Amino acid sequence: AVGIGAVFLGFLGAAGSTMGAASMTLTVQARNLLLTVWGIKQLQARVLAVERYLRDQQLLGIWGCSGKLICCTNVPWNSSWSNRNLSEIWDNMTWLQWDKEISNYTQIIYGLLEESQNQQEKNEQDLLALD
Amino acid sequence: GAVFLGFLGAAGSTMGAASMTLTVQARNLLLTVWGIKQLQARVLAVERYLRDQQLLGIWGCSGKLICCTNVPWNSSWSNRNLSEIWDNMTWLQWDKEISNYTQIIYGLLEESQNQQEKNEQDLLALD
Amino acid sequence: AVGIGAVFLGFLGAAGSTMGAASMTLTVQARNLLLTVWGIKQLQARVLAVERYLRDQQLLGIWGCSGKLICCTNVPWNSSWSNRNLSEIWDNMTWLQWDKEISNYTQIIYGLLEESQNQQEKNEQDLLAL
Amino acid sequence: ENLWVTVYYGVPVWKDAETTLFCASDAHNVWATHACVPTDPNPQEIHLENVTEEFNMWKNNMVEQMHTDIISLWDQSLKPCVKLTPLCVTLQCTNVTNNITDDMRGELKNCSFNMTTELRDKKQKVYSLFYRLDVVQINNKEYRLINCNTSACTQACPKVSFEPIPIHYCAPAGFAILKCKDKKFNGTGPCPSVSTVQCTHGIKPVVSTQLLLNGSLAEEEVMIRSENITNNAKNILVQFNTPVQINCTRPNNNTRKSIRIGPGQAFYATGDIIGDIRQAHCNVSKATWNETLGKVVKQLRKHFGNNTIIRFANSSGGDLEVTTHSFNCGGEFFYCNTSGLFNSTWISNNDSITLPCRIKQIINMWQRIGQCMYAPPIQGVIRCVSNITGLILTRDGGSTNSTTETFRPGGGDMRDNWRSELYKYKVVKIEPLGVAPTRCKRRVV
Amino acid sequence: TLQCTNVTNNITDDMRGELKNCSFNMTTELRDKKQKVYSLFYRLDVVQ
Ligand SMILES: *[C@@H]1O[C@H](CO)[C@@H](O[C@@H]2O[C@H](CO)[C@@H](O[C@@H]3O[C@H](CO)[C@@H](O)[C@H](O)[C@@H]3O)[C@H](O)[C@H]2NC(C)=O)[C@H](O)[C@H]1NC(C)=O
Ligand SMILES: *[C@@H]1O[C@H](CO)[C@@H](O[C@@H]2O[C@H](CO)[C@@H](O[C@@H]3O[C@H](CO)[C@@H](O)[C@H](O)[C@@H]3O)[C@H](O)[C@H]2NC(C)=O)[C@H](O)[C@H]1NC(C)=O
Ligand SMILES: *[C@@H]1O[C@H](CO)[C@@H](O[C@@H]2O[C@H](CO)[C@@H](O[C@@H]3O[C@H](CO)[C@@H](O)[C@H](O)[C@@H]3O)[C@H](O)[C@H]2NC(C)=O)[C@H](O)[C@H]1NC(C)=O
Ligand SMILES: *[C@@H]1O[C@H](CO)[C@@H](O[C@@H]2O[C@H](CO)[C@@H](O[C@@H]3O[C@H](CO)[C@@H](O)[C@H](O)[C@@H]3O)[C@H](O)[C@H]2NC(C)=O)[C@H](O)[C@H]1NC(C)=O
Ligand SMILES: *[C@@H]1O[C@H](CO)[C@@H](O[C@@H]2O[C@H](CO)[C@@H](O)[C@H](O)[C@H]2NC(C)=O)[C@H](O)[C@H]1NC(C)=O
Ligand SMILES: *[C@@H]1O[C@H](CO)[C@@H](O[C@@H]2O[C@H](CO)[C@@H](O)[C@H](O)[C@H]2NC(C)=O)[C@H](O)[C@H]1NC(C)=O
Ligand SMILES: *[C@@H]1O[C@H](CO)[C@@H](O[C@@H]2O[C@H](CO)[C@@H](O)[C@H](O)[C@H]2NC(C)=O)[C@H](O)[C@H]1NC(C)=O
Ligand SMILES: *[C@@H]1O[C@H](CO)[C@@H](O[C@@H]2O[C@H](CO)[C@@H](O)[C@H](O)[C@H]2NC(C)=O)[C@H](O)[C@H]1NC(C)=O
Ligand SMILES: *[C@@H]1O[C@H](CO)[C@@H](O[C@@H]2O[C@H](CO)[C@@H](O)[C@H](O)[C@H]2NC(C)=O)[C@H](O)[C@H]1NC(C)=O
Ligand SMILES: *[C@@H]1O[C@H](CO)[C@@H](O[C@@H]2O[C@H](CO)[C@@H](O)[C@H](O)[C@H]2NC(C)=O)[C@H](O)[C@H]1NC(C)=O
Ligand SMILES: *[C@@H]1O[C@H](CO)[C@@H](O[C@@H]2O[C@H](CO)[C@@H](O)[C@H](O)[C@H]2NC(C)=O)[C@H](O)[C@H]1NC(C)=O
Ligand SMILES: *[C@@H]1O[C@H](CO)[C@@H](O[C@@H]2O[C@H](CO)[C@@H](O)[C@H](O)[C@H]2NC(C)=O)[C@H](O)[C@H]1NC(C)=O
Ligand SMILES: *[C@@H]1O[C@H](CO)[C@@H](O[C@@H]2O[C@H](CO)[C@@H](O)[C@H](O)[C@H]2NC(C)=O)[C@H](O)[C@H]1NC(C)=O
Ligand SMILES: *[C@@H]1O[C@H](CO)[C@@H](O)[C@H](O)[C@H]1NC(C)=O
Ligand SMILES: *[C@@H]1O[C@H](CO)[C@@H](O)[C@H](O)[C@H]1NC(C)=O
Ligand SMILES: *[C@@H]1O[C@H](CO)[C@@H](O)[C@H](O)[C@H]1NC(C)=O
Ligand SMILES: *[C@@H]1O[C@H](CO)[C@@H](O)[C@H](O)[C@H]1NC(C)=O
Ligand SMILES: *[C@@H]1O[C@H](CO)[C@@H](O)[C@H](O)[C@H]1NC(C)=O
Ligand SMILES: *[C@@H]1O[C@H](CO)[C@@H](O)[C@H](O)[C@H]1NC(C)=O
Ligand SMILES: *[C@@H]1O[C@H](CO)[C@@H](O)[C@H](O)[C@H]1NC(C)=O
Ligand SMILES: *[C@@H]1O[C@H](CO)[C@@H](O)[C@H](O)[C@H]1NC(C)=O
Ligand SMILES: *[C@@H]1O[C@H](CO)[C@@H](O)[C@H](O)[C@H]1NC(C)=O
Ligand SMILES: *[C@@H]1O[C@H](CO)[C@@H](O)[C@H](O)[C@H]1NC(C)=O
Ligand SMILES: *[C@@H]1O[C@H](CO)[C@@H](O)[C@H](O)[C@H]1NC(C)=O
Ligand SMILES: *[C@@H]1O[C@H](CO)[C@@H](O)[C@H](O)[C@H]1NC(C)=O
Ligand SMILES: *[C@@H]1O[C@H](CO)[C@@H](O)[C@H](O)[C@H]1NC(C)=O
Numbered sequence: 079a080v081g082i083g084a085v086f087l088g089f090l091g092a093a094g095s096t097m098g099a100a101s102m103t104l105t106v107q108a109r110n111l112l113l114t115v116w117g118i119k120q121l122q123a124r125v126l127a128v129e130r131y132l133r134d135q136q137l138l139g140i141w142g143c144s145g146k147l148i149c150c151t152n153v154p155w156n157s158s159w160s161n162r163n164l165s166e167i168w169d170n171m172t173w174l175q176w177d178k179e180i181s182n183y184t185q186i187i188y189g190l191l192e193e194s195q196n197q198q199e200k201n202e203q204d205l206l207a208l209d
Numbered sequence: 210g211a212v213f214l215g216f217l218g219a220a221g222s223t224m225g226a227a228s229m230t231l232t233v234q235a236r237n238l239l240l241t242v243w244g245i246k247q248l249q250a251r252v253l254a255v256e257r258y259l260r261d262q263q264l265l266g267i268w269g270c271s272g273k274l275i276c277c278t279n280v281p282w283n284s285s286w287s288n289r290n291l292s293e294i295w296d297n298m299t300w301l302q303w304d305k306e307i308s309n310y311t312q313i314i315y316g317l318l319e320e321s322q323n324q325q326e327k328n329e330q331d332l333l334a335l336d
Numbered sequence: 337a338v339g340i341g342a343v344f345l346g347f348l349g350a351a352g353s354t355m356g357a358a359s360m361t362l363t364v365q366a367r368n369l370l371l372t373v374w375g376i377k378q379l380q381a382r383v384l385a386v387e388r389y390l391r392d393q394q395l396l397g398i399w400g401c402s403g404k405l406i407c408c409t410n411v412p413w414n415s416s417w418s419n420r421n422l423s424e425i426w427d428n429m430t431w432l433q434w435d436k437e438i439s440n441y442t443q444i445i446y447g448l449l450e451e452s453q454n455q456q457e458k459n460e461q462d463l464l465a466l
Numbered sequence: 467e468n469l470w471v472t473v474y475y476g477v478p479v480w481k482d483a484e485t486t487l488f489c490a491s492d493a494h495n496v497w498a499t500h501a502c503v504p505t506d507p508n509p510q511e512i513h514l515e516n517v518t519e520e521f522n523m524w525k526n527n528m529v530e531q532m533h534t535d536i537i538s539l540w541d542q543s544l545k546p547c548v549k550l551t552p553l554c555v556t557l558q559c560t561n562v563t564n565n566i567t568d569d570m571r572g573e574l575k576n577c578s579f580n581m582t583t584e585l586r587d588k589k590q591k592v593y594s595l596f597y598r599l600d601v602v603q604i605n606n607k608e609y610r611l612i613n614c615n616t617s618a619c620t621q622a623c624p625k626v627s628f629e630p631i632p633i634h635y636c637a638p639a640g641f642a643i644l645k646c647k648d649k650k651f652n653g654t655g656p657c658p659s660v661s662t663v664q665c666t667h668g669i670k671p672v673v674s675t676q677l678l679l680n681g682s683l684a685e686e687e688v689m690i691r692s693e694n695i696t697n698n699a700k701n702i703l704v705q706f707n708t709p710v711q712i713n714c715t716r717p718n719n720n721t722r723k724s725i726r727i728g729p730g731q732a733f734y735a736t737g738d739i740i741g742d743i744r745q746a747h748c749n750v751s752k753a754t755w756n757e758t759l760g761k762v763v764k765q766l767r768k769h770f771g772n773n774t775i776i777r778f779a780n781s782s783g784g785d786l787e788v789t790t791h792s793f794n795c796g797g798e799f800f801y802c803n804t805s806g807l808f809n810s811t812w813i814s815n816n817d818s819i820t821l822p823c824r825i826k827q828i829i830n831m832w833q834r835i836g837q838c839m840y841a842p843p844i845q846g847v848i849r850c851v852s853n854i855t856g857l858i859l860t861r862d863g864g865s866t867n868s869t870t871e872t873f874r875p876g877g878g879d880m881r882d883n884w885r886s887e888l889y890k891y892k893v894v895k896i897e898p899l900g901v902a903p904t905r906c907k908r909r910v911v
Numbered sequence: 912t913l914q915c916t917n918v919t920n921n922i923t924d925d926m927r928g929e930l931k932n933c934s935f936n937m938t939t940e941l942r943d944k945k946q947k948v949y950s951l952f953y954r955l956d957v958v959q
């Protein structure tokens with residue numbers, strides 16, 4: 079295979095698709111993520127996008143994911159948050175509906191993900207100090 | 210409830226007493242004349258955060274707040290016991306004299322991490 | 337060993353050297369990488385530099401190199417890009433000539449690297465499901 | 467349960483938030499639009515199926531930002547031009563008699579006055595032609611400009627032109643522009659065919675108050691949009707699926723003469739006219755306007771009762787910019803009387819008309835009495851060929867039992883003109899944070 | 912140029928000479944006309 083091109087899905091192409099199908103197009107969204115009145119407005123918008131990106135990277139850095147898109151955690155998933163089958167959410171539900179369905183608990187979820195990793199971090203520490 | 214500490218609350222505490230409240234300070238790093246002044250200060254803060262993150266990423270601490278290195282500490286820079294410096298000394302007092310010797314420490318950490326990466330590459334190549 | 341002075345290679349000093357010789361001068365370039373009209377122009381220049389560094393960091397972050405300078409990849413190197421011996425491409429060629437040699441295949445390499453890392457993460461997720 | 471939460475980056479989540487858009491142009495350049503980066507060739511259009519977005523106009527910030535950007539660009543464009551402060555002087559003015567007609571009698575005035583020159587030690591007596599709406603009587607009587615008691619203003623430089631070149635609005639990093647591809651998209655509702663785009667299409671920022679000139683056509687039929695159709699105080703936007711051609715002209719062979727009023731700077735006064743002088747007018751085809759009005763009545767019969775008598779009436783009163791259709795034609799501002807276009811009633815069941823237009827030299831068109839702008843004269847006759855694709859109606863409520871429904875042209879605000887074209891686009895903010903359960907755990911090294 | 916006179920219209924003796932009634936020729940909206948108008952000023956910001 080030498081005379082073929084490379085074509086991927088466009089920006090937000092899998093917005094209405096399933097979770098399993100939209101999980102393979104996160105790279106394009108991640109890459110697209112990044113007279114003086116006009117200059118001040120443009121620089122303010124660019125800088126605002128910069129703190130939003132750094133805030134997202136900082137929120138991911140406090141967890142056990144140092145930059146990877148897909149990553150697993152050690153905290154258990156509370157069944158009381160959704161009480162639904164994994165097969166039907168990953169095969170018959172988009173990301174928009176899933177986002178508005180659990181829009182409340184995400185914040186407190188982030189908090190456990192954070193402290194948990196904190197104690198988890200010192201876990202390897204009191205083991206790595208045994209060397 | 211749960212109360213750990215606040216921002217910069219362990220400034221007067223010792224080394225060991227301040228060794229577990231570093232994560233809150235870790236997240237703490239992040240008419241038109243006042244607007245451009247605020248924008249300039251904000252850009253400076255972002256640049257300082259990216260510079261610190263870049264220096265951490267150069268070493269083996271890209272995404273870790275606590276990390277050790279395989280370089281031997283040179284006793285000429287400290288000349289003190291571990292328990293004495295970790296139980297009867299603060300961060301400010303140590304910062305007063307480590308400021309002159311932090312450049313050589315940073316340089317040795319960078320070359321040592323590069324050497325470690327080269328050794329890891331050779332180990333992966335030789336399987 | 338109390339009056340030992342330490343000096344390193346200068347900024348971009350390993351440009352004319354070989355690939356192996358310049359491979360140990362990456363940390364210096366990485367650390368050195370970072371009235372209203374004058375302020376806005378200098379602010380725009382600094383913001384552009386920060387955005388370029390952010391884009392490069394994100395480019396290395398989407399791959400399996402989130403932080404480490406030297407990193408490998410399971411995808412192989414096809415001879416269509418450059419069919420040269422390893423004994424001479426690392427000891428008889430600089431970074432400038434080598435970059436100008438395969439400058440037309442950088443986008444293809446970047447695309448295959450990102451899709452390979454995406455499928456690698458999917459395979460790792462499926463492996464952790466056992 | 468053997469389930470563990472996992473975080474995902476770059477997930478397609480849309481939130482509604484404020485965002486400052488970026489200007490773009492096709493790109494010698496004029497109208498000072500070079501301050502923004504030019505548009506990128508072949509903009510990407512990505513269709514988004516299996517998703518419905520609740521589009522809602524009259525609250526979108528894109529039209530507000532466009533209004534602010536147009537005001538700022540106009541203010542910055544008028545900055546290098548020279549101010550017209552020495553014009554506020556006593557004007558010994560009289561009427562015109564040379565080949566004047568009956569309808570144009572008293573409309574134009576020949577005013578003579580003393581004005582400074584490049585030498586501050588001496589003055590010069592000159593004369594110029596001014597319209598009746600441009601001068602007011604102080605008491606061969608003395609006259610003065612209409613903007614003398616108000617703040618003075620600059621004039622349009624002869625190098626810059628008023629051509630409404632299309633501009634594009636590109637979203638910054640982390641935001642997206644959604645466009646509704648529905649052929650019969652309503653005012654507010656869930657659009658079935660949504661598609662994201664990097665930059666908006668070519669939008670011409672024209673200036674109009676009663677008839678939408680050079681606007682975007684519809685898809686298959688004329689559309690009626692309104693925030694509250696039952697409210698008489700809300701403007702009714704009408705979009706045409708076919709364009710109604712209009713031919714506006716000024717047969718006056720005006721001559722522009724430059725007189726020195728200071729060091730280097732000069733004022734372009736109206737010289738002597740050439741030949742016969744006639745009133746400027748606009749011609750509209752009777753058949754096309756009649757069938758367009760019939761289509762409009764047919765669409766209004768779907769919202770209200772189809773067995774209800776409908777009638778069109780002219781403007782009630784107020785400012786000249788609201789009552790008369792104000793627009794621009796080759797650099798000359800026109801104020802046409804639309805009484806001949808809204809003088810028909812419709813029951814439940816070759817030839818063209820002319821409209822006289824007045825010409826002013828002091829134009830604000832933004833209700834900003836804080837300032838103005840002097841339109842310099844244009845050499846030769848003025849000819850403009852265009853086509854209206856919309857209307858801004860207003861319901862004259864007060865009746866009962868759904869009887870004698872009347873519509874009058876209105877919409878003095880400048881946001882309706884841009885709302886009739888920016889209704890398809892919407893700004894959304896991308897949220898890359900996502901969470902989902904997966905049967906996986908992080909291995910401990 | 913200002914033509915100021917002393918005010919003696921129910922003024923306390925402590926301010927005898929502090930307030931000045933000045934008159935001057937100032938331009939109007941029309942650059943070809945001028946008007947004679949009066950105003951009150953203080954002795955601290957007015958010099959001979
Ligand atoms: C929008 O929704 C439609 C309706 O679901 C999608 O069409 C079809 O969707 C299925 C499931 O996502 C695609 O996978 C197929 O599933 C069937 C079982 O139902 C299986 O037998 C097939 O082997 C295949 O795996 C299917 O390719 C797809 N298209 C068809 C039938 O032409 C549509 O894909 C959705 N749009 C987007 C952008 O996702
Ligand atoms: C990478 O891409 C560039 C751009 O396409 C390549 O540069 C091009 O190289 C060819 C030769 O390889 C040049 O053709 C020349 O044409 C002249 C006039 O006909 C002829 O006299 C020469 O003998 C030669 O054939 C071409 O001008 C040049 N530039 C462009 C814009 O096409 C480059 O070769 C590519 N490198 C690799 C390794 O593929
Ligand atoms: C507006 O009013 C002015 C006067 O206030 C009109 O100016 C007129 O200009 C013409 C042409 O310069 C003068 O004609 C003169 O003719 C004699 C020969 O008979 C010749 O020797 C002169 O050199 C000059 O050409 C005319 O006298 C003058 N009018 C007056 C009252 O002095 C101007 O034409 C008027 N504009 C309009 C549009 O009515
Ligand atoms: C609505 O669009 C039409 C065209 O689609 C506009 O008509 C065009 O208007 C411009 C500027 O008024 C005309 O350009 C002029 O051309 C003459 C030719 O000699 C030149 O001397 C002038 O300096 C100026 O450049 C143009 O001819 C005219 N027609 C066409 C077919 O382009 C109309 O102005 C637009 N409506 C509004 C309100 O802007
Ligand atoms: C989040 O929790 C609230 C309850 O605190 C859920 O109910 C909403 O409550 C607010 C006011 O408290 C109302 O304005 C909303 O209309 C309620 N929502 C519904 C659907 O009735 C809310 O549903 C929760 N959101 C989630 C789980 O996504
Ligand atoms: C200030 O210093 C005092 C003493 O140096 C600290 O008191 C110690 O507190 C810890 C627990 O917080 C005890 O285990 C020690 O025994 C205490 N020391 C003594 C001598 O009794 C105090 O915590 C310090 N406060 C801060 C904010 O650093
Ligand atoms: C770090 O550097 C400073 C300045 O280079 C040193 O300060 C010296 O302090 C001594 C005693 O206080 C003075 O006699 C010298 O004159 C100072 N130096 C200069 C250049 O003025 C400081 O001692 C250094 N730290 C260590 C641990 O050596
Ligand atoms: C520039 O090239 C010269 C020539 O290779 C380098 O000097 C050394 O030359 C000997 C010749 O036998 C080689 O064996 C060495 O390997 C060369 N040194 C190195 C470090 O490769 C010289 O170092 C080069 N300098 C730069 C700045 O690239
Ligand atoms: C322009 O200036 C001329 C002369 O300076 C004015 O003509 C006469 O000026 C004298 C004053 O020197 C007046 O007494 C006369 O009444 C003026 N004549 C007339 C017919 O008015 C002339 O009035 C000035 N023009 C304007 C518009 O002020
Ligand atoms: C849309 O217009 C209708 C008709 O005018 C409004 O309905 C009435 O509004 C008035 C004043 O707002 C109220 O006093 C009446 O009670 C309303 N009638 C009914 C039956 O509720 C309506 O409020 C407007 N707005 C919306 C959002 O529908
Ligand atoms: C405005 O003027 C244009 C002039 O081009 C008119 O265009 C006419 O179009 C028909 C259509 O086939 C031609 O047969 C005529 O020859 C054109 N006229 C001329 C003078 O060439 C257009 O009809 C006019 N519109 C209105 C409303 O008056
Ligand atoms: C009338 O409006 C249309 C659409 O806004 C303008 O566009 C042209 O319309 C004609 C006939 O419908 C098409 O054949 C052309 O392809 C359209 N495009 C261009 C670039 O000409 C049309 O220009 C308007 N009429 C006038 C006289 O300006
Ligand atoms: C304002 O101007 C008038 C003139 O228009 C001044 O009145 C006198 O004018 C004559 C000439 O007609 C001069 O010779 C006199 O010197 C002027 N002054 C007086 C006091 O007679 C008037 O004085 C001016 N006012 C001020 C405050 O300067
Ligand atoms: C290069 O070769 C590898 C296997 O040797 C193959 O997978 C790849 O598709 C080839 N690429 C090109 C561009 O030929
Ligand atoms: C799950 O949520 C419920 C309330 O919704 C809470 O009581 C419980 O402690 C949570 N955790 C587990 C492990 O059930
Ligand atoms: C969930 O799936 C299991 C088997 O996979 C099935 O027995 C159960 O009924 C499902 N529950 C719901 C609510 O669909
Ligand atoms: C370290 O501790 C020992 C025992 O208390 C003491 O003798 C020695 O002086 C200490 N070292 C220093 C540098 O004070
Ligand atoms: C102490 O530092 C010097 C450099 O100043 C270095 O050469 C020496 O090797 C160091 N000593 C030890 C024991 O590492
Ligand atoms: C590359 O290596 C092969 C042996 O593996 C040798 O025959 C050939 O000459 C070498 N080519 C170059 C350019 O060194
Ligand atoms: C200026 O004069 C006109 C003439 O009628 C009047 O309508 C307007 O209100 C005046 N403006 C001011 C600010 O006096
Ligand atoms: C369509 O828009 C009109 C005008 O606002 C409104 O009266 C009507 O309810 C809308 N219909 C739908 C289905 O949204
Ligand atoms: C206007 O007058 C000038 C004077 O020379 C003449 O050249 C031109 O043809 C006239 N234009 C018209 C439309 O009559
Ligand atoms: C407009 O129509 C009138 C007749 O009603 C005609 O005399 C005039 O020449 C026309 N003007 C244009 C520009 O077509
Ligand atoms: C307008 O069109 C309608 C078509 O229903 C026709 O009945 C009517 O007579 C027309 N009016 C004029 C003035 O042409
Ligand atoms: C027209 O009005 C009559 C009155 O009852 C109604 O029956 C009919 O459905 C209406 N037609 C349309 C197309 O609205
Ligand atoms: C509207 O029309 C009536 C009757 O023709 C007329 O009296 C009135 O002055 C007109 N108003 C405007 C603003 O044209």
Ligand SMILES: *[C@@H]1O[C@H](CO)[C@@H](O)[C@H](O)[C@H]1NC(C)=O
Nearest residue numbers: 780789790802803804805806
């Ligand atoms: C518009 O024309 C009608 C026709 O009679 C006239 O009554 C009305 O006064 C005109 N409007 C203006 C503002 O002159």
Ligand SMILES: *[C@@H]1O[C@H](CO)[C@@H](O)[C@H](O)[C@H]1NC(C)=O
Nearest residue numbers: 804805806807808809810811
């Ligand atoms: C408006 O329509 C009436 C209806 O007969 C007519 O008498 C009048 O002349 C018309 N006015 C204009 C300006 O067309």
Ligand SMILES: *[C@@H]1O[C@H](CO)[C@@H](O)[C@H](O)[C@H]1NC(C)=O
Nearest residue numbers: 915916917918926927928929
């Ligand atoms: C005004 O009062 C001051 C202070 O008493 C005095 O010096 C001056 O001569 C007075 N001027 C006149 C005109 O009375």
